[PDB]
Design a protein around this ligand. Sequence first.
Ligand SMILES: Nc1nc([C@H]2CC(=O)OC23CCCCC3)cs1
Length: 340
Amino acid sequence: EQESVKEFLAKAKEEFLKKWESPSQNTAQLDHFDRIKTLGTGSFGRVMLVKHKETGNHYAMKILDKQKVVKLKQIEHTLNEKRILQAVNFPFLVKLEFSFKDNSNLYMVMEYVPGGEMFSHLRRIGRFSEPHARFYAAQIVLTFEYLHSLDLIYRDLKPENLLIDQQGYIQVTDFGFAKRVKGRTWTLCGTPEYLAPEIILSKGYNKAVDWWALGVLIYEMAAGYPPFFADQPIQIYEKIVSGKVRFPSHFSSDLKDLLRNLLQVDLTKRFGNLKNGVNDIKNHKWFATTDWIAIYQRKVEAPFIPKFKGPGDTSNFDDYEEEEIRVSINEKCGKEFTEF
Ligand SMILES: Nc1nc([C@H]2CC(=O)OC23CCCCC3)cs1
């Protein structure tokens, strides 16, 4: 590896480890913010656009209901998410500004990226050209190079988690499945279309699952649909484990070759998991036109700038029923979330 990359990654790991070992806690409180709009809602949490009442800055506040986190067996995952996010620093990761908890909820106050999910833009236009897909893919390659060097596995790569920023670059959101792993881990998590075979088969798995998911993402960006598509999860899983993939004729030969090596069912043969690591990907012919440094430095003009009116515009996100942020008069699940 170029000594330049080695020294960059050594510093990145030093800085991560200092914050990892001494995490920040309790750096804001709920009544510092006004609520604007619900941007997403799930079985144990929500993301809400908020505005800081003193600075006027907008943020995407992730609110997790402690009781539901416990019921759905997400305790460790929520602790992972916050501890990791407060310790990382990379251009293509949404930044965690503040975190805190109260009697009912956990809060992660993230920068608000107003351009919408990649998923929305992909579905709007149908499919991305290869250069357009490659620009986003290159950012994910660099992001995974960074995360994996810190012993982090991301485990939730999918188009909904890639937000398009004011410069047209991606920022990855939702670290709910991210984990610091030396060696193997076992939890079943991730969206069906993106799961690596070794997850489906209940094996001890490693960072190679992220590289598999990159193959799925690149395929979906370039085709408009994912490679193992089927109507129900069990049918998806049968296709994933089969070792067969079909490519649209419009794909270039270089794209097909890269994808066969990312979508390799034998994890010991999968690009990103061989002796040369990420460099088998970065040096592949499909990436021959990619200026990795210029991407990292945000010096490349992006494929498109999302249409939005300002840092508070929510037009690129969807509409959800607006529910209370109620805080119990009694502390819930205090022991479980002590470290948050
Ligand atoms: N020569 C150098 N390259 C960098 C960048 C850009 C790149 O290709 O990889 C880095 C370092 C490793 C993590 C991802 C970002 C920094 S110094």
